[PDB]
């Protein structure tokens, strides 16, 4: 009858864009509820613009806070909307606090929850993302798993097979809908040329990496060392959480002092795809960037002790180095010489359309 | 270092009482956070009094509301307390919204959660209690399962065996600590004699039974019919949710008009144990009452389509009849002739002490 998409953050907007593209080709009555978990223009507005997405019908203006504060406000405010609008399906993507809050509200209202990117596991169930995803999976009526590994994760937790659909990851659709747009846009090319030929691309924002000063210090030390050993320039797109933490721990001024590191504010998706595509290698703790690196055939080094997309490591596209600078140094050598051929485990880029078809039929 | 018990409702207070008794015999620094989900004196204060429990250190005064509103306020307010007090273990009992909120706050703060009465499943994961219990189990560090069935439920959902302890149900301790107290107290005996020799005892409050008018009507019809067929008096302890719904659906005046039904306001635990012990049979949709009926060797008829304590049906103590008056009529005949011998699957009444020992050692 009626579908509500609930989203809050940069990666959700990007990964829901192919679902929105598919919904636009149907007669389905649907709208977006934005929690405004993310609110800075370069974390939010820019994606609605570049991805040609409609304005949310509801903006809850929750923003930042501690987990209980933020999630609690979300339960209160999302419920007010769902009690009024009464959709019969709620769609949430991924593993943010917005996802959990949307699913929890819907489940108690007896509204079917469709979870896009279901079944991913790092088995670091101490991570807030792992908590969010596990809990959401257990109250979902449709579990859209990106891979057979994810499906098997769900089966091992006793979830009924008829709820699970292996549809690929919508990030393939997004990277495939937008890379050629980025490549053929003169403004995007001009941005790229203003910022950049040999470089490593870095993003870092996991709570467990940037909220912990000695882990953050270790990673910064590691980056300084990569630069000296390999004589490589680094382009660092800096998440606002990470900027705040770097300043809190007095590490920010040391990065800006390093003339081989170019620090840039968060950029739009088209701009970022260009930075990824052209990087000699990608260093990250982002979930989506691990996937994009794999899709774009650019070697990835993941600054985490584990990942919830192990298929990237399994196919040879990615290597985990955590906090450890020696592991990081060795990984750079390995990946610098790595042939950029590997399988893509995440599907053929029509996941959004498949998800909408499944929800249409039920 | 420090333990926080978080509770909100009548059944939690009763089932946590043996844990409190055990904690009092130790040097552990512990206190109670009360969400005040329940607040009426006969749902709350009376249990703190009769069970000789200390005043909560914190009262959050959340009270009633819809699920998102109530749970959301709980996340906000519980987090404020836990950020200040910083316990290293949080104990929650059962499956109420208070349990889920406490566990969710603690999990994101990286505080170990101990779940008392873990692993129970009705597999009606559309029930709010089933949602609460499943989600809580998946973020718990200690899972205190009452039976091997419950342990197996947890294992089937992929939970690590080293987190699971089959300790029995603390309701055995409570029924065993308090029945002899009730029996030897003159005021309790006087209450019993004022209210009551042959009767059936009824309680009914599941959301799915009392919020749904035609289900509630069906059950009331069923009770009227039992009375006529078996010529039996009914004592009905009426939960405040149920009173509100009966009046909303214009069924309350019909019950009060039935001279074979004695409607009583909710009573204290000592008083209720006496009513249970002396009933010819018990009719209920309560979780705790199903257990107590089994423990007290009084036949039980459960007005639900399923139960999360199937061991009571398995040992012959209980039968499910749902909404169906014909099933109810047949069940009364069966249970009226049932020999009051069966196994007790819920342990030997020292679960509270075992739980505290486990938390002490880790
Ligand atoms: C618990 C949770 O849901 N975490 C998600 C959140 O992390 P993220 O780190 O963004 O978590 P928050 O939404 O809590 O924001 C953290 C901090 O970043 C700053 N801030 C955030 C948003 C903004 O528009 N402007 C701003 O300045 C604030 O200082 C804020 O306190 O989004 C990430 C995407 O980028 C996801 O990978 C994370 O899974
Ligand atoms: C979702 C949830 O956590 N449900 C639990 C809650 O149900 P319960 O039915 O009590 O659920 P609520 O706490 O939401 O209260 C429901 C209604 O009962 C009335 N009311 C409630 C409490 C009170 O002290 N006074 C009062 O009058 C109010 O009208 C209120 O709106 O407690 C029961 C114990 O009895 C448990 O079996 C349920 O699992
Ligand atoms: O300056 C940037 C950095 C990242 N991204 C995109 O952000 C997404 C990933 O989001 P994020 O790293 O914030 O979160 P995570 O995937 O770890 O949840 C990917 O699709 C990136 O292409 C972007 O558009 N601009
Ligand atoms: O008038 C009453 C009715 C019940 N109880 C006790 O309430 C507990 C069960 O709580 P409830 O039925 O409200 O909730 P549930 O067990 O279904 O969560 C049992 O221990 C009962 O003995 C009580 O003390 N007085």
Do residues B332 and B1 lie in contact, with contact meaning Cβ atoms separated by under 8 Å?
Answer: no
- Please answer whether residues A191 and A297 qualify as being in contact, where contact means their C-beta atoms are separated by less than 8 angstroms: no
For the CA atoms of A242, A243, A248, A253, the dihedral, rounded to the nearest 10 degrees, stands at 130
The rounded distance, in Å, linking the Cα atoms of B227 and B17 is: 36
Which residue, among A348, A347, A339, has the nearest Cα to A298 in the 3D structure?
A339
State the resolution, in angstroms: 1.4
Pull the structure tokens for residue A324. Answer: 């450890």
DSSP for residue B323: T
Name which residue sits closest to atom 31 of ligand 2, judged by CA.
B64
- In 3D, which of A111, A168, A166 has the Cα closest to residue A140? A111
Q: Which residues of A touch B128 (CB under 8 A)?
A: 108
Rounded to an integer, what distance in angstroms lies between the CA atom of residue B319 and that of residue A145? 39
Of B75, B83, B158, the CB nearest to A71: B75
Of B82, B107, B157, the CB nearest to A131: B107
Q: Compute the distance between CA of residue A68 and CA of residue A72 in angstroms, rounded to an integer.
A: 6
Among A34, A36, A7, A9, smallest CA distance to A19 is for A7
Whole-angstrom distance, CA of residue B318 vs CA of residue A292: 56
Strand partners, B296: none
Q: Is A355 exposed, middle or buried (0-12, 13-18, 19+ CB in 10 A)?
A: buried
Assigned token pair, A362: 């039920």
Collapsing DSSP states into helix, strand and coil, what is residue A97? Answer: helix
Helix (H, G, I), strand (E, B) or coil at B157: coil
The whole-angstrom separation of Cα A281 and Cα A37 is 30
Whether the CB-CB separation of A118 and A137 falls below 8 Å is answered with yes
CA–CA separation, B5 vs A229, rounded Å? Answer: 54
Q: Are B331 and B296 in contact (CB under 8 A)?
A: no
Contact criterion met (CB below 8 Å) for B285 and B203: yes
Distance CA A347, CA A173 (A): 9
Query: How many Å apart are CA B93 and CA B98, to the nearest integer?
Result: 9
**Strand spans (E) along chain A:** 3-7, 30-34, 58-59, 89-93, 112-116, 142-145, 164-166, 199-203, 233-237, 261-264, 281-284, 300-302, 318-320
The ligand minimizing its distance to the Cα of B13 is 4
E strand spans, B8-49: 30-34
CB of residue A40 inside a 6 A radius of ligand 1: yes
Residue B290 CA to residue B344 CA, distance in Å, equals: 12
Q: How was this structure determined?
A: X-ray
A130: left (phi over 0), alpha (psi -120 to 50) or beta: alpha
End-to-end Cα distance, chain B: 12
Which residues fall within 8 angstroms of residue B203, CB to CB, at 6 or more apart? B236, B237, B238, B239, B283, B284, B285, B286, B289
Q: What residues are paired with B283 via a beta bridge?
A: B202, B301
d(CA A337, CA A185): 32
Of A16, A35, A38, A131, the one to substitute when testing ligand 1's pocket (max ligand atoms within 8 A of C-beta) is A38
Closest chain B residue to the Cα of A135, Cα to Cα = B135
Q: What is the rounded distance in angstroms from the CA atom of residue A92 to the CA atom of residue A120?
A: 14
Residues 6+ apart with CB under 8 A from B139: A125, A131, A134, A135, B103, B104, B106, B107, B113
Cα separation, A324 vs A209, whole angstroms? 12
Residue count of chain A, please give it: 362
**Which tokens in the block code for residue A61?**
């203006």
Chain A residues touching chain B at CB-CB below 8 Å: 66-69, 71-76, 78-80, 82-83, 104-105, 107-110, 125-126, 128, 131, 134-135, 138-139, 156-158
A133 lines ligand 1 (CB under 6 A): no
Asked if A147 and A346 count as a contact pair (C-beta separation under 8 A), the reply is yes
Chain A closest-CA separation from residue B279 CA (Å): 35
Q: Answer yes or no: do B108 and A131 touch at CB < 8 A.
A: yes
- For the CA of B39, the nearest atom of ligand 2: 24
- What is the CA A171 to chain-centroid distance, rounded? 9
Cβ of B14 below 6 Å from ligand 4: yes
Give the separation between CA B135 and CA A12, rounded to whole angstroms: 23
Q: How far is CA B202 from the centre of its chain?
A: 15
Does residue A37 contact residue A96 with C-beta atoms inside 8 Å?
Answer: yes
Catalytic residue among A34, A38, A205, A239: A205
Q: Which of A79, A104, A128 sits opposite B66 (nearest CB)?
A: A79
Please report residues of A whose CB lies closer than 8 A to that of B73: 72, 76
Can you list the positions of beta strands (E) in chain B? 3-7, 30-34, 58-59, 89-93, 112-116, 142-145, 164-166, 199-203, 233-237, 261-264, 281-284, 300-302, 318-320
B3-7/B30-34 β-pairing: parallel
Look at residues B242, B287, B308 and name the one whose alpha carbon lies nearest to residue B300.
B287
Task: Kindly compute the dihedral angle of the four CA atoms of residues B93, A156, A138, A349, in this order, to the nearest 10 degrees.
Answer: 160
Q: What DSSP designation does B262 have?
A: E
Using a 10 angstrom Cβ sphere, with 0-12 exposed, 13-18 middle and 19 or more buried, the burial of residue A313 is middle
With CA atoms as reference, report the closest residue to A106 among A140, A137, A135.
A140
Give the residue whose CA is nearest to atom 10 of ligand 3: A11
String of DSSP letters for A304-344:
SS--S-THHHHTTSEEE-TT-HHHHHHHHHHHHT--S----
* Inter-chain CB proximity A74 and B76 less than 8 Å: no
Give residue for tokens 């790595």.
A338
Query: What does the alpha-carbon distance between residue B306 and residue B118 come to, in Å, rounded to a whole number?
Result: 18
- SS3 of A263, please? strand
CA A292 / ligand 3 centre spacing (Å): 9
* Residue B205 annotated as catalytic: yes
Rounded to 10°, the helix B10-23/B287-295 angle is 60
Atom in ligand 4 nearest the alpha carbon of residue B290 = 16
**Cβ-defined contact of A68 to B125 (cutoff 8 Å):** no
Q: How far apart are CA B129 and CA A230, in angstroms?
A: 57
* B4 within ligand 2 shell (Cβ under 6 A): no
Number of residues that this document lists for chain B: 362
> What is the DSSP secondary structure assignment for residue B161, as one 8-state letter?
G
For chain A, the straight-line distance linking the first and the last C-alpha, in angstroms and rounded, comes to 12
User: Tokens representing A83?
Assistant: 């009690």
Give the tokens for residue A306. Answer: 């584990």
| Domains present along chain B, CATH in parentheses | 2-183+347-362 (3.40.50.2000), 184-346 (3.40.50.2000)
Which residue has tokens 């006969």? Answer: B42
Kindly list the residues of chain B whose beta carbon comes within 8 Å of any beta carbon in chain A. 66-69, 71-76, 78-80, 82-83, 104-105, 107-110, 125-126, 128, 131, 134-135, 138-139, 156-158
Which residues in B69-99 are b (16+ Cβ under 10 Å) and which e?
Answer: bbbbbbbbbbbbbbeeeebebbbbbbbbbbb
Q: Which structure tokens are listed for A69?
A: 């504060």
For residue B269, give every residue at least 6 positions away whose Cβ sits within 8 Å of its Cβ, in sequence order, or none: B14, B46, B47, B50, B51, B174, B178, B182
Beta bridge partners of A236: A202, A263
Two structure tokens written together for B14: 């009763």
**Burial class (CB within 10 angstroms; exposed 0-12, middle 13-18, buried 19+) of A173:** buried
**Shortest-distance atom of ligand 4 to CA B273:** 22
Strand partners, A113: A90
Other residues' Cβ atoms within 10 Å of the Cβ of residue A165: 17
Q: What angle do CA A295, A301, A305 make, to 5 degrees?
A: 115
B167: buried, middle or exposed (CB in 10 Å: 19+, 13-18, 0-12)?
buried
CA distance A312 to A319: 8
**CB of B203 closer than 6 A to ligand 4?**
yes
């Amino acid at each position: 009858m009626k579908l509500s998409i609930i989203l809050g953050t940069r990666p959700e907007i990007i990964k829901l864009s192919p679902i929105i593209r598919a919904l636009e080709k149907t007669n389905i009555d649907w709208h977006i509820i934005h929690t405004n978990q993310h609110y800075s223009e370069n974390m939010d507005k820019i994606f609605f613009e570049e991805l040609n997405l409609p304005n949310p019908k509801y903006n809850l203006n929750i923003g930042s806070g501690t987990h209980g504060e933020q999630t609690g406000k979300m339960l209160i405010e999302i419920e007010k909307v769902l009690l009024k609008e009464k959709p019969d399906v709620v769609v949430v993507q991924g593993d943010t606090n917005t996802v959990l809050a949307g699913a929890l509200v819907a489940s108690k209202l007896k509204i079917d929850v469709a979870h896009v990117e279901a079944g991913l596991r790092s088995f670091d169930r101490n991570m807030p993302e792992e908590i969010n995803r596990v809990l959401t999976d257990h109250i979902s009526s449709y579990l859209f798993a990106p891979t057979e590994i994810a499906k098997n994760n769900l089966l091992r937790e006793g979830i009924e097979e008829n709820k699970i659909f292996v549809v690929g990851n919508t990030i393939v659709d997004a990277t495939l809908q937008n890379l050629k747009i980025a490549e053929k846009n003169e403004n995007v090319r001009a941005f790229f040329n203003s910022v950049v030929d040999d470089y490593f691309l870095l993003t870092l924002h996991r709570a467990e990496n940037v909220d912990n000063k000695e882990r953050l210090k270790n990673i910064v030390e590691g980056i300084f060392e990569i630069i000296e050993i390999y004589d490589k320039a680094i382009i660092f797109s800096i998440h606002p959480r990470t900027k705040k933490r770097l300043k809190e721990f007095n590490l920010f001024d040391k990065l800006k002092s390093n003339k081989k590191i170019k620090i840039i504010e968060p950029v739009g998706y088209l701009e970022f795809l260009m930075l990824e595509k052209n990087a000699e290698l990608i260093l990250t703790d982002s979930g989506g960037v691990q996937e994009e690196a794999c899709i774009l055939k650019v070697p990835c080094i993941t600054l985490r002790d584990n990942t919830e997309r192990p298929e990237t490591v399994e196919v040879g596209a990615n290597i985990l180095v955590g906090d450890n600078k020696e592991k990081l140094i060795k990984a750079v050598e390995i990946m610098l010489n790595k042939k950029r051929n590997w399988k893509n485990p995440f599907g053929n880029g029509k996941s959004g359309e498949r998800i909408v078809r499944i929800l249409t039929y039920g």
